Design a protein around this ligand. Structure first.
Ligand code: SF4
Ligand code: SF4
Ligand code: SF4
Lengths: 392, 53, 69, 212, 161, 184, 111, 57, 148, 53
């Protein structure tokens, strides 16, 4: 039966795991309340995306990609179309890059809203768990308008640009949402910084130093939550992100409270980059741009190489050129890299997905050292994992 | 004050707010109401509303 | 000998000694020997075979492959 | 033979006798199970967020009586909201066997119907959830809309009402138990609970640190 | 001889660890070929040089029946940067004895990433703590992501019928 | 103290009292929900519900097979050497294996494949999802032509300012498509 | 530990069964074919599966007792049960509540 | 006026998500006309009720 | 009302081709195919959009091409005719079978007309199509429904 | 009330406005085939919820 011994007790967190960040299994062993070790068992969602990719052309594989970081969506499609387009030297127009910045920043907000909802219920108050769904459902319809389905399987990113231009009443509908959402961002900050029962669950709980974050290898709002200031939209001048003014959010504490505040402040800078991109959009609204192509349709400043959504409509039999390559995209939860090497055929020779969720999860044994049983979910909920990006 | 002593102590023995039977902290699997299904769980389900009333 | 796009089958004596046996399991599955695998993209000494099973394709040598007419 | 994968003839007469009183006590048996069935809060892959969006305020979960019970015993319905790999395929049958017998799995998404886009070349994906558990309703999509799964609840609710009360005995599994002896060597369990205090993390071993 | 070296090849030349400098990338970073006996000598110098960030320890198959490759991309992480210097170290290893020394003691980033190289490819990492399979069942026998992997006839991996 | 303990209860039980004022004011708001089977929300103009097929327009090109992520649609064609033009005899896409990525309707030369609006495809049997050429060539269930369903619109289709589909008596999308054809 | 290989029809546990509760053993391998009655069996074909179950356990008694190796027996058993459907020996159970036809639809021979 | 299966119409009623979109119709069922809209990337056909459509010559 | 008797079975013995109108929330159609299943009738609930041409699926054998997904060849699975092969499997003690076509909102008006007359020419075989919706479960013959 | 603070409806479609939703949630538990866990006590398992309620 179930006896009562004196050695430390190992509890299996189980692959069931009723939480929204996938199927993780932790064999955390307890010392009454303190944990002394924890091994994460991953790969419950290992489907083999690096083996599929060697038998898919790029337009066959673009539907596959927005399932690793399925919280984000088009952050996976960002790296995937970037890997042959920065290897073949295919120019993306400036309008297609500006829609990519619009789509990636709305994905980073929706990635952060999907992290925040579970995390607020993990740390306490679960009444905002039902009101951050509604905030994400507005971004769901900005993706359903422009692209197809809802939040993933939205084949928007292409090699020469983007799949199609925006709809007609679209830019005026972020400006209805992104001006309504930005009041609610500060509501989320004053949920945890005020009510100081939550600050005693998040100060010093899962504290990782700056020197051990670079060694263990982290990225995004978990590296930058230790005062590292390393953002690959600023470090690599990534596709017209350098045309905007926005400050990389850091925190010099390392704890879970610092990791919380950087992510909410990354929502705030995301709407900042959004509003600088809607006004700096080359054709502006699409119906404003489509009208200029009807009044001056022969040869205008519009209908050029820019002011359009695709550079060249590439064939399905687009051969990747030969050569190694490593492409970074600053995802919502870190660096999503892929290590593309191709031969002259249309399939890549090796497609190594370097996930952000992978390298941030290997410190979770180390962060669960001295913490309590109730703090285990507060650590794992703050690393912002998506099992599926971890496992692939 | 004694109404407030009764009110916090009653809800800490019947309600759903100060209750770790939802194992959202994962201190257990689902608490003591884990292996209970069917008519025995109905006593754990509906008998926590007799205790609330 | 073996073209691109013809049904081949794998000989089990030449397979379970070489470097191709280190990657896989030694108890080879029966789809490998019934001749229905279609050869695509011969690259030098090695051929990639698309068996009618819905699993990833295998690169095997042209010595370990026999044409199944 | 003459017809591949045939249908066996039901040789029983299926005498499902029912008067006015038993049919009235059968409509309550079915209405109480369709209008309040409880899904296990389960999901592995992307399709759980299309199922968790149905918990939210825009599409109401508890409108059909769905209360998400995060334990296999208190739940009956199990919406398989995620791709089932080689791992989690023993875990899913365990969560299905740990259920009171009016179960009603519904598949969700393309990757539990036929393992949809990993059905072509992927070395560890179960191609369809009904290679493991018996399913009631299928649901195509990748992901489905939250409206699309509430149609699959409506298709499920129409299927609970067909269930007669005299067929409760066929809901139990049958044990055609066979046994055999083997000579396979038992392996020690590779996954033991120690990670940080394993005797390889404390210091780099000799014959490695000399080249460091 | 044929191809010239870069700033990391000239730095390792001055420390008497002569590496086979491959060409540039398609993105313009340096590729360096290091044998499996001089890896921890090279990595201890580059970590002391300033390459404090191991980014994407990837294992790569250079062809069926050819030598397996363990690529070590790494970058000089700082508090602020404008395309900081990066280098990819490539360690070729034969299919017979795929053993590369583990760089976990240089960068702890290669804890899962060298396990994923051992999970998919057959590359055993000497001096690795907890070298098991992460992504797969731990009792699996095959090495997927090789070109040679023959997937078994499991009933779950078949068609949906 | 005996006075410090009874006065340490008022500082919290008042703060709880102005917490219940907020939660009761959450009940003042109208439930912004979508009652599904009686108010089906309208899909977008680019929503990829399921595929439609035109058998008199498919000239056996097999571009749909080569651009599908899993090579799904079964184009069955003979060459028909008397006419020297391949006329297909059967076409079928097996939904349930479908991800609805709609690569086939995009790289279509003849505009034969096309996405519909209907997401409400869900069967008791898996093999009843294997739609024929004459089962894909049917009429999509339009949401607004149902005399049981009051269809509410979606966000990014409401007019400018409103963020809900229930207080919408009329209107259109947020901006005109050709206002500057007579204006400018 | 309970090493098990549970597909839809072939449940192979490493141990013996006393009334639902399974005790993990090292010598035995219990097997109940088709727990949910999707197939209508008979005594002629149940002996064919039970002779196949003796055949694979005796053949694979040089390997290691892992869940990978039990999943290979239950794979070859479930591949054998499906061949008993395409031979027309057993048939689908219509008294089951679900008719999803997991081992392929009924189909006639050569039209 | 009647509608022929293969000509271009445009929608006319304002209580509809497709206000003045246009394209070639397809598969005229005896009550319903499905109009392929050719919108942007993925061509989408939505049906109507053999009315609220004006042909554009 | 609640205590519905077996009047639904009597209309199916008379009309043969019924057209149900169910509430869209679901759960109240299937109480009328328990009255039908208690009276000897087996029920085969199909989905109406998945059927192709009704003559080729129901009364004829049909070549159902499975998803080969690039790895197989173009197989043709000739399934037996649905309303025929299912009539030859129910026992002669039991009565006919009833097609319970859910999602009948997306069938053509020339497909209800084929389903109406098919119950005449085939002995002991009926259909029930769940076309449309209404707040109360109400039925009518399919010959009535193709008129309006 | 929990749906009103979340701006969802609550149980419609059963009864008029959920009036039968306590009844069907309590009647499905009486109809479910309550089976004990395999290796467990029997008398202490059944009187488990009885001593609570
Ligand atoms: S079909 Fe798509 S959404 Fe559903 S589980 Fe698979 S990947 Fe996720
Ligand atoms: S892609 Fe379109 S045009 Fe080409 S064969 Fe298929 S349906 Fe016909
Ligand atoms: S729906 Fe998408 S995945 Fe399916 S066949 Fe069409 S293009 Fe291919």
């Amino acid at each position: 039966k179930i006896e009562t011994r004196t050695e430390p007790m190992v509890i299996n967190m189980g692959p069931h795991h009723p939480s929204m960040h996938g199927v993780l299994r932790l064999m955390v062993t307890l010392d009454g309340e303190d944990v002394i070790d924890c091994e994460p068992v991953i790969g419950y969602l290992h489907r083999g995306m690096e083996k599929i990719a060697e038998n898919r052309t790029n337009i066959m594989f673009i539907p596959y990609v927005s399932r690793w970081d399925y919280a984000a969506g088009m952050f996976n499609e960002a790296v995937t179309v970037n890997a042959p387009e920065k290897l073949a030297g295919i120019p993306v127009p400036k309008r297609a890059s500006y829609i990519r910045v619009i789509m990636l920043e709305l994905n980073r907000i929706a990635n952060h809203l999907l992290w925040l909802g579970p995390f607020l219920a993990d740390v306490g108050a679960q009444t905002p768990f039902f009101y951050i769904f509604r905030e994400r459902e507005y971004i769901y319809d900005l993706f359903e308008a422009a692209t197809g389905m809802r939040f993933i399987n939205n084949n928007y990113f292409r090699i020469g640009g983007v799949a199609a231009d925006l709809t007609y009443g679209w830019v005026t509908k972020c400006r209805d949402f992104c001006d309504y959402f930005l009041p609610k961002v500060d509501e989320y900050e004053r949920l945890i910084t005020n009510n100081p029962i939550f600050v005693r669950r998040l100060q010093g709980v899962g504290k990782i130093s700056r020197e051990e974050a670079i060694n263990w290898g982290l990225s995004g709002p978990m590296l930058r939550a230790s005062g590292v200031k390393w953002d690959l939209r600023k470090v690599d001048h990534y596709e017209c992100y350098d045309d905007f003014d926005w400050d990389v959010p850091v925190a010099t504490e390392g704890d879970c409270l610092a990791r919380y505040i950087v992510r909410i402040q990354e929502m705030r800078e995301s709407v900042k980059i959004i509003r600088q991109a809607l006004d700096g959009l080359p054709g502006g609204p699409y119906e404003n741009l489509e009208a200029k192509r009807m009044l001056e349709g022969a040869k205008s400043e519009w209908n050029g190489f820019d002011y359009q959504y695709i550079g060249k409509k590439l064939s399905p039999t687009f051969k990747i050129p030969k050569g190694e390559h490593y492409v970074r995209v600053e995802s919502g939860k870190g660096e999503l890299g892929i290590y593309l090497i191709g031969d002259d055929n249309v399939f890549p020779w090796r497609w190594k997905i370097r996930p952000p969720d992978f390298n941030n999860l290997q410190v979770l044994p180390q962060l669960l050292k001295g913490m309590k049983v109730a703090d285990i979910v507060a650590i794992l909920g703050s690393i912002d994992v998506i099992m599926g990006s971890v496992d692939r | 004050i004694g109404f407030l002593v009764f009110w916090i102590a009653a809800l800490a023995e019947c309600e759903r707010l100060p209750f770790d039977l939802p194992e959202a902290e994962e201190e257990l699997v689902a608490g003591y109401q884990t292996e209970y299904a069917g008519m025995k769980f109905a006593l754990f389900y509906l008998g926590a509303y007799v205790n609330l009333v | 000998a073996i073209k691109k796009g013809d049904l081949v089958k794998v000989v089990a004596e030449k397979l379970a000694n070489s470097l191709e046996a280190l990657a896989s399991d030694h108890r080879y599955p029966p789809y490998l020997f019934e001749g229905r695998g279609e050869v695509v993209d011969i690259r030098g000494d090695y051929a990639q075979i698309k068996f009618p099973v819905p699993t990833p394709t295998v690169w095997l040598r042209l010595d370990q492959l026999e044409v199944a007419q | 033979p003459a017809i591949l994968n045939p249908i066996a003839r039901p040789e029983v007469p299926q005498e499902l006798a029912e008067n006015i009183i038993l049919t009235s006590l059968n409509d309550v048996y079915d209405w109480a199970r369709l209008s309040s069935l409880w899904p296990l809060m389960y999901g592995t892959a992307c399709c759980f967020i299309e199922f968790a969006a149905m918990i939210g305020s825009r599409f109401d979960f508890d409108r059909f009586g769905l209360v998400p019970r995060n334990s296999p015993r208190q739940a009956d319905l199990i919406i398989t909201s995620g791709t089932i790999t080689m791992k989690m395929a023993p875990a899913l049958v365990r969560l299905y066997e740990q259920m009171p017998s009016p179960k009603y799995v519904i598949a969700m998404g393309a990757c539990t119907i036929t393992g949809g886009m990993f059905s072509s070349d992927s070395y560890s994906a179960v191609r369809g959830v009904d290679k493991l558990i018996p399913v009631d309703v299928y649901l195509p999509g990748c992901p489905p809309r939250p409206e699309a799964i509430m149609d699959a609840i409506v298709k499920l609710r129409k299927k609970i009402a067909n269930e007669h009360i005299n067929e409760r005995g066929n809901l139990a599994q049958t044990h055609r138990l066979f046994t055999a002896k083997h000579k396979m060597k038992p392996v020690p369990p590779i996954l033991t609970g120690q990670y940080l205090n394993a005797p390889s993390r404390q210091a780099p071993p000799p014959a490695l640190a000399a080249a460091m | 001889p044929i191809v010239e070296a870069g700033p990391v090849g000239r730095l390792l030349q001055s420390q008497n660890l002569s590496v086979e400098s491959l060409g540039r990338d398609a993105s313009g970073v340096e590729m360096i070929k290091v044998d499996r006996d001089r890896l921890l000598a090279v990595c201890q110098t580059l970590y002391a040089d300033g390459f404090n960030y191991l980014r994407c320890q990837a294992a790569y198959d250079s062809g069926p029946g050819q030598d397996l490759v363990s690529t070590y991309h790494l970058i000089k992480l700082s508090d602020n940067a404008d395309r900081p210097p990066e280098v990819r170290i490539k360690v070729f290893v034969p299919r017979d004895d795929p053993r590369v020394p583990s760089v976990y003691w240089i960068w702890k980033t290669a804890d899962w990433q060298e396990r994923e190289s051992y999970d998919m490819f057959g590359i055993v990492y000497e001096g690795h703590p907890n070298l098991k399979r992460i992504l797969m069942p731990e009792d699996w026998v095959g090495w997927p992501l090789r070109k040679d992997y023959i997937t078994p006839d499991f009933y779950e991996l078949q068609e949906a019928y | 103290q005996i006075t410090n303990y009874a006065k340490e209860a008022v500082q919290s039980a008042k703060y709880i009292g102005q917490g219940l004022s907020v939660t009761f004011d959450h009940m003042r708001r109208r439930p912004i929900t979508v009652q599904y089977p009686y108010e089906k929300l309208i899909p977008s103009e680019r929503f990829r519900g399921r595929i439609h097929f035109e058998f008199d327009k498919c000239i056996a090109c097999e571009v749909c097979v080569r651009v599908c992520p899993i090579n799904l649609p079964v184009v069955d064609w003979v060459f028909n050497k008397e006419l020297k033009k391949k006329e297909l005899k059967h076409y079928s896409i097996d939904f349930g294996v479908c991800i609805f990525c709609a690569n086939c309707v995009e790289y279509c030369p003849t505009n034969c494949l096309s996405v519909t609006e209907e997401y409400e495809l869900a069967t008791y049997d898996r093999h009843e999802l294997n739609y024929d050429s004459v089962a894909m060539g049917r009429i999509p269930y339009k949401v607004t032509q149902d005399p049981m369903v009051t269809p509410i619109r979606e966000f990014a289709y409401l007019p400018a300012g409103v963020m809900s589909g229930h207080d919408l008596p009329a209107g259109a999308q947020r901006a005109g498509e050709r206002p500057e054809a007579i204006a400018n | 530990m309970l090493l098990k290989s549970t597909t839809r029809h072939v449940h192979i546990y490493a141990g013996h069964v006393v009334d639902g509760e399974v005790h993990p053993d090292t010598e035995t391998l219990t097997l109940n074919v088709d727990p949910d009655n999707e197939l209508e069996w008979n005594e002629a074909a149940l002996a064919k599966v039970e002779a196949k179950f003796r055949e694979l356990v005796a053949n694979a008694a040089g390997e290691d007792l892992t869940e990978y190796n039990l999943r290979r027996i239950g794979s070859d058993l479930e591949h054998f049960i499906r061949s008993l459907l395409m031979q027309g020996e057993i048939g689908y159970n219509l008294n089951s509540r679900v008719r999803n036809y997991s081992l392929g639809i009924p189909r006639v021979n050569h039209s | 006026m009647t509608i022929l299966p293969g000509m271009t119409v445009k929608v006319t009623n304002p209580n509809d998500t497709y206000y003045q979109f246009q394209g070639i119709v397809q598969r005229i069922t005896d009550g319903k006309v499905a109009v392929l809209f050719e919108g942007g990337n993925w061509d989408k056909l939505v049906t109507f009720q053999a009315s609220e459509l004006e042909p554009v010559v | 009302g609640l205590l519905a008797g077996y009047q639904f079975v009597k209309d199916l013995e008379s009309a043969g081709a019924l057209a149900l109108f169910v509430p869209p929330e679901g759960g109240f159609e299937g109480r009328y195919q328990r009255r039908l299943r208690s009276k000897g009738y087996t029920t085969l609930p199909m989905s109406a959009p998945g059927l192709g041409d009704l003559a080729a699926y129901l009364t004829q054998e049909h070549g159902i091409r499975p998803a080969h997904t690039g790895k197989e060849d173009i197989r043709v699975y000739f399934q037996p005719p649905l309303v025929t092969y299912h009539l030859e499997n129910l026992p002669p003690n039991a009565k006919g079978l009833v097609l319970w076509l859910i999602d009948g909102k997306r069938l053509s008006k020339q497909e209800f007309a084929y389903l109406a007359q098919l119950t005449q020419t085939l002995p002991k075989f009926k259909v029930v199509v769940e076309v449309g919706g209404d707040r109360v479960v109400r039925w009518e013959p399919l010959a009535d429904w193709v008129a309006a | 009330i929990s749906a009103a603070v979340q701006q969802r409806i609550g149980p419609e479609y059963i009864g008029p406005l959920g009036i039968l939703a306590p009844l069907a949630d309590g009647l499905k538990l009486i109809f479910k085939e309550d089976v004990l866990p395999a290796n467990s006590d029997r008398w202490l398992f059944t009187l488990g919820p009885a001593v609570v309620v």
